[PDB]
Homo-oligomer: A and B are copies of this chain.
Amino acid sequence: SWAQSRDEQNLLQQKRIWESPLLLAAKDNDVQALNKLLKYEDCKVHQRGAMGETALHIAALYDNLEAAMVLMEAAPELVFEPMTSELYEGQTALHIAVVNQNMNLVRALLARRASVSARATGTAFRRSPCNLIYFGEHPLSFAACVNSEEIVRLLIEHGADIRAQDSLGNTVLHILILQPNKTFACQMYNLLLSYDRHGDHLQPLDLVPNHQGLTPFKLAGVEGNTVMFQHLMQKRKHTQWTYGPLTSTLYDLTEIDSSGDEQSLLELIITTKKREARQILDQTPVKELVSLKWKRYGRPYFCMLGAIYLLYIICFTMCCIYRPLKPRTNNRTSPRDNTLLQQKLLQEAYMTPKDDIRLVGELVTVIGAIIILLVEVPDIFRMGVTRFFGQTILGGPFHVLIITYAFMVLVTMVMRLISASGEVVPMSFALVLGWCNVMYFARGFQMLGPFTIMIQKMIFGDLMRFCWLMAVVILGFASAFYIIFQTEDPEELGHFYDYPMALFSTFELFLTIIDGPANYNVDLPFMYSITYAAFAIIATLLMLNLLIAMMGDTHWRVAHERDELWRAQIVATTVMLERKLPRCLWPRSGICGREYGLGDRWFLRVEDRQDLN
């Protein structure tokens, strides 16, 4: 019901034109009608429209020059007047002549000393999926987007500064990155730097952060404006000597390393949600860097780190398979042979030399559990809650498993202090999830780990929507078998002796695991065989084989979109490992400066073999 009111405003506009005698004449080039109406009678021209119009706004918006010039004689003050409220706030008619790319009207408007710094703060101008455009606020910025050069050149020469900011703090430079037409907006970025002839004490216009603190270089990284990102690097690279087909260039490396607090490119690349921004890692001053940070100094710690964790889970299992057990206590098998269990868990007996060893190993799990949680205390206290799940699916979607591994060990640590009975169930989940967590290290050892990328990509999506179609075909047929074997003696055919297990029975048939029931000695009821034949032709001949082909086709739509996932994930492994590990080891990468008298910036060189035979 929200945007419904927007249209209802907009139809209400046109009706005012169809009922005002002035404005309908202003909609057309009605020279004679506006001649006799204005100069003769005594009626005001301050008739605001449905969204706060003037006569001059409509004639501008319906691109009509000659009727607007006649209005200038009657209007000394309609030029300064803005539009009123709630969608188009503050927008004077100087804007509309700009958006229509000329009318030879800004000539006449600046002849009438039009203000060049009115700020269009209306609702239909904020950056949002609701509006179809984002042009900023100031009228100098508007001509930048429609790419009209001499209209821009005209606007500087009447004193419009190039350093205004919107509510978002974004400059007129920042608007050009967000535009959809890329190469046709490239020259404006050249031309606007050309009119920065005042070398300012503050910064030369290219270093202004917004309200979220972003230079227009880095903002190109987030939105993935690749062709523009190729162009902005061109100023920074400082070429050295050329030798035939060789060229040893030198890239700048200041605003893309992990040194500062701003995180500067790399954490901002992986924390995007946009898909196209991962394309930036193919570009040549960046692609070279992560190969250096991984093949040196990143790989061997990560392989050494996984080896320590691999001994952790082993030392957990060796203090898992030895538990304090005893014979069954005084209670005999009081249910008639449906109750077979025999040991029940010693109470407070450690008095052996052997359990002295186990108490050491049992503590090794406990201290290791606490270290994990102390890592994840500050993390959820800083990265919100939903923000953490924005981090999650890309390169850390385990990150509750390592938490819940630490959770269950603290559960079973309490469970033996109070020394209660049902202690096997926390021991179960911690044992499986401990081994499942070591698949996190599959990124290394070579590129024989995009399986764990793909097996994430497929356990969500494909298998997830397939289970609901399982979950009801399994539900009727299992409910049907329980009725048809209600009559029978379950001494033969113990599949279906009560309604809970007949579900779990049917789930075993549905994946063709349990053997399929038969007796061959008792006449089983006839409605079984008609029903069960109808089960198999659905279960293991239609539904399950459909799952393979649906698995098959979805595997090669994502072949090319597999290898970019891996090389994306290595960076997220890298930068997190840099961030949580202190220095005095694996130094700030690239060659230092200012010992060579070059500057406090640090650099790296890259050679290449050229072309043009």
Shortest Cβ distance from residue A180 to the other chain B in the assembled complex, whole angstroms? 9
Given that A343-B487, A556-B553 are contacting pairs, would A515 and B514 also be in contact in the complex, using a CB cutoff of 8 Å?
yes
CB distance A321 to B435 under 8 Å?
no
* Set of chain B residues within 8 Å of A542, measured between Cβ atoms: 455, 458-459, 463
- Contact partner of A99 among B132, B244, B536, CB < 8 A? B244
* Set of chain B residues within 8 Å of A304, measured between Cβ atoms: none
Interfacial residues of chain A within 70-120, with CB under 8 A of chain B in the complex: 96, 99-101
User: Which of these binds chain B: A208-216, A283-291, A436-444?
Assistant: A436-444
CB distance B246 to A14 under 8 Å?
no
Q: Does A512 contact B (CB under 8 A)?
A: yes
* Set of chain B residues within 8 Å of A418, measured between Cβ atoms: none
CB distance B523 to A339 under 8 Å?
yes
Interfacial residues of chain A within 101-150, with CB under 8 A of chain B in the complex: 101, 132-133, 146
User: Which of these binds chain B: A155-163, A356-364, A392-400, A601-609?
Assistant: A601-609
Shortest Cβ distance from residue A58 to the other chain B in the assembled complex, whole angstroms? 9
Shortest Cβ distance from residue A53 to the other chain B in the assembled complex, whole angstroms? 11
Number of chain copies forming the complex: 2
CB distance B341 to A525 under 8 Å?
yes
User: Which of these binds chain B: A3-11, A194-202, A253-261?
Assistant: A3-11
- Contact partner of A15 among B448, B490, B551, B596, CB < 8 A? B596
Q: Does A550 contact B (CB under 8 A)?
A: yes
CB distance B504 to A533 under 8 Å?
yes
* Set of chain B residues within 8 Å of A184, measured between Cβ atoms: 612
* Set of chain B residues within 8 Å of A469, measured between Cβ atoms: 439, 442, 449, 451-452, 455
Encoded as 1 (CB less than 8 Å from any B CB) or 0, chain A from 460 to 483 comes to 000111101100110111011011
Docked Cα-Cα span, A612 to B184, in Å, equals 11
- Contact partner of A11 among B504, B527, B591, CB < 8 A? B591
* Set of chain B residues within 8 Å of A459, measured between Cβ atoms: 542
CB distance B504 to A529 under 8 Å?
yes
- Contact partner of A549 among B433, B482, B548, B603, CB < 8 A? B548
Q: Does A581 contact B (CB under 8 A)?
A: no
Interfacial residues of chain A within 190-243, with CB under 8 A of chain B in the complex: 240-241, 243
Q: Say what secondary structure dominates the interface of chain A.
A: helix
* Set of chain B residues within 8 Å of A529, measured between Cβ atoms: 504
Name the CB-closest residue of B to A469.
B451
Name the CB-closest residue of B to A448.
B465
* Set of chain B residues within 8 Å of A504, measured between Cβ atoms: 529, 533
CB distance A431 to B14 under 8 Å?
no
Name the CB-closest residue of B to A241.
B61
Shortest Cβ distance from residue A88 to the other chain B in the assembled complex, whole angstroms? 10
Shortest Cβ distance from residue A291 to the other chain B in the assembled complex, whole angstroms? 13
Name the CB-closest residue of B to A244.
B99
- Contact partner of A475 among B435, B472, B473, B607, CB < 8 A? B435
Q: Does A427 contact B (CB under 8 A)?
A: yes
Interfacial residues of chain A within 524-542, with CB under 8 A of chain B in the complex: 525, 527, 529, 531, 533-534, 536-537, 540-542
Docked Cα-Cα span, A79 to B133, in Å, equals 66
Given that A61-B243, A62-B241, A483-B320 are contacting pairs, would A472 and B428 also be in contact in the complex, using a CB cutoff of 8 Å?
no
- Contact partner of A476 among B12, B434, B458, CB < 8 A? B434
Interfacial residues of chain A within 161-207, with CB under 8 A of chain B in the complex: 181, 184
- Contact partner of A428 among B337, B483, B552, CB < 8 A? B483
CB distance A480 to B340 under 8 Å?
no
* Set of chain B residues within 8 Å of A458, measured between Cβ atoms: 542, 546
* Set of chain B residues within 8 Å of A597, measured between Cβ atoms: 15, 18-19
Q: Does A312 contact B (CB under 8 A)?
A: no
Docked Cα-Cα span, A101 to B323, in Å, equals 81
- Contact partner of A514 among B508, B516, B523, B555, CB < 8 A? B516
CB distance B435 to A479 under 8 Å?
yes
Given that A435-B475, A494-B521 are contacting pairs, would A343 and B486 also be in contact in the complex, using a CB cutoff of 8 Å?
yes
Name the CB-closest residue of B to A11.
B596
* Set of chain B residues within 8 Å of A483, measured between Cβ atoms: 320-321, 323, 424, 427-428, 431
Name the CB-closest residue of B to A493.
B520
* Set of chain B residues within 8 Å of A146, measured between Cβ atoms: 244-245
Encoded as 1 (CB less than 8 Å from any B CB) or 0, chain A from 40 to 68 comes to 00000000000000000000011000000
Shortest Cβ distance from residue A311 to the other chain B in the assembled complex, whole angstroms? 15
Name the CB-closest residue of B to A435.
B476
- Contact partner of A527 among B424, B520, B546, CB < 8 A? B424
Shortest Cβ distance from residue A252 to the other chain B in the assembled complex, whole angstroms? 14
Name the CB-closest residue of B to A535.
B432
Q: Does A20 contact B (CB under 8 A)?
A: no
* Set of chain B residues within 8 Å of A553, measured between Cβ atoms: 555-556, 559
Give 3 closest A-B pairs by Cβ, nearest first: A435-B476, A494-B520, A99-B244
A residues with a Cβ closer than 8 A to B are 7-8, 10-12, 14-15, 18-19, 61-62, 96, 99-101, 132-133, 146, 181, 184, 240-241, 243-246, 248, 317, 320-321, 323, 325, 337-344, 424-425, 427-428, 431-436, 438-439, 442, 448-449, 451-452, 454-455, 458-459, 463-466, 468-469, 472-473, 475-477, 479-480, 482-484, 486-490, 492, 494-495, 497, 499, 504, 507-508, 511-516, 518, 520-523, 525, 527, 529, 531, 533-534, 536-537, 540-543, 545-553, 555-556, 559, 591, 596-597, 603-605, 607-609, 611-612
Instruction: Return 6 A-B CB contacts under 8 Å, by A number.
Output: A14-B596, A132-B609, A432-B480, A435-B472, A436-B472, A449-B465
